[PDB]
């Protein structure tokens, strides 16, 4: 019980910042996650033996794809850590537990293809789960891993606390389906502006946790420019593989996914920042003021893509 994880000095300080990059040393990522659980949640939240076994089974069930990989999982959990740590008193003990675990598991067994490609391919998962197809799959993989002998990190919760955390994780993982973000953010916007927003209303907390999940999921746009720009290569490597597979089904893909239209990337990033990322971090910052550094970093990155278009890089 007296066994802490400690990080080297630079990581001990930088892990607390929203723009932290977890680095290229994969074998330190589990340790980084346990560190974040210990500080976010407590040294008693989980049996270390079970938590380590859970982490390693999760890692094994992420695939070797350019972006939707184990690094993404840990990165998304770090952004949740930073939100939780800057909003100490707003979240219950169950929510802190559930949300880091949800972030770690939110893309389990991703193949690097969108919901839309699965439906056009007529993948068996598109028959089992008609909407949020990959996200319902990620939640299914999460429940499966939790039921492996030795992996039930929630075993010391009471029966009703166990049902609550699995429900926090289900809604948090479904919320990472970007198709659902637009409605959720619009509704949070109206509620914040007419002043009906009420963090004691469960259906409102669910909406706010959804937005936190979108914010954490998109957090590549909130890093320092060199991280954001090199992450974009990984994201587009999957988009363009998907476009290739569309062309194999005899469907011209959208330009976002066509490797023949790489020149259009900078203008496509502008649309994405303006339509998704800025609106996401603006509402998050209106609901949770200490998450403003995410909105500031995002706007810095929009300005860098505007400089790419003006030829200044
Ligand atoms: C889910 N997600 C994460 C990112 C993202 C985040 C960070 N870096 C790169 C991409 C994106 C995205 O780019 N989205 C995105 C890119 C383009 C586009 C259109 C034409 C030509 C090139 N790109 N359209 N959209 C909607 N979507
Ligand atoms: Mg996902
Ligand atoms: Zn994700």
UniProtKB/Swiss-Prot annotation:
Domain of life of the source: Eukaryota
Residue sites binding 3',5'-cyclic AMP per the record: 68, 269
Function: Plays a role in signal transduction by regulating the intracellular concentration of cyclic nucleotides. Can hydrolyze both cAMP and cGMP, but has higher affinity for cAMP and is more efficient with cAMP as substrate. May play a critical role in regulating cAMP and cGMP levels in the striatum, a region of the brain that contributes to the control of movement and cognition.
Record remark: domains: The tandem GAF domains bind cAMP, and regulate enzyme activity. The binding of cAMP stimulates enzyme activity. Composed of a C-terminal catalytic domain containing two divalent metal sites and an N-terminal regulatory domain which contains one cyclic nucleotide-binding region.
Disease: Dyskinesia, limb and orofacial, infantile-onset: An autosomal recessive, early-onset hyperkinetic movement disorder characterized by axial hypotonia, dyskinesia of the limbs and trunk, orofacial dyskinesia, drooling, and dysarthria. The severity of the hyperkinesis is variable.
Subunit text: Homodimer.
Family: Belongs to the cyclic nucleotide phosphodiesterase family.
Protein name: cAMP and cAMP-inhibited cGMP 3',5'-cyclic phosphodiesterase 10A
Organism for this UniProt entry: Homo sapiens
């Amino acid at each position: 019980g007296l066994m802490q994880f400690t990080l080297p000095v630079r990581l001990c300080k930088e892990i607390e910042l929203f723009h932290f990059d977890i680095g290229p040393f994969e074998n330190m990522w589990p340790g980084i996650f346990v560190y974040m659980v210990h500080r976010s949640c407590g040294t008693s939240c989980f049996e270390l033996e079970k938590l380590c076994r859970f982490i390693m089974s999760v890692k094994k069930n992420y695939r070797r794809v350019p972006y939707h990989n184990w690094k993404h999982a840990v990165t998304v959990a770090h952004c949740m850590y930073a939100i939780l740590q800057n909003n100490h008193t707003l979240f219950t003990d169950l929510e802190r537990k559930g949300l880091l675990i949800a972030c770690l598991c939110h893309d389990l067994d991703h193949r690097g293809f969108s919901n839309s490609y699965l439906q056009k391919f007529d993948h068996p998962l598109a028959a089992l789960y008609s909407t949020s197809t990959m996200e319902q799959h990620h939640f299914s993989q999460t429940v499966s891993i939790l039921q492996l002998e030795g992996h039930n990190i929630f075993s010391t919760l009471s029966s009703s606390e166990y049902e609550q955390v699995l429900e926090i994780i289900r809604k948090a993982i479904i919320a990472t389906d970007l198709a659902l973000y637009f409605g959720n953010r619009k509704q949070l916007e109206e509620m914040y502006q007419t002043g009906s927003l009420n963090l004691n209303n469960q259906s409102h907390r669910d909406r706010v946790i959804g937005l936190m999940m979108t914010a954490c999921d998109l957090c590549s746009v909130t890093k320092l420019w060199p991280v954001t720009k090199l992450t974009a290569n990984d994201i587009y490597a999957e988009f363009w593989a998907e476009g290739d597979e569309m062309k194999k089904l005899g469907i011209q893909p959208i330009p976002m996914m066509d490797r023949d239209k790489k020149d259009e990337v900078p203008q496509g990033q502008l649309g994405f920042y303006n339509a998704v990322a800025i609106p996401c971090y603006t509402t998050l910052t209106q609901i949770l003021p200490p998450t403003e550094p995410l909105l500031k970093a995002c706007r810095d990155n929009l300005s860098q893509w505007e400089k790419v278009i003006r030829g200044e890089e």
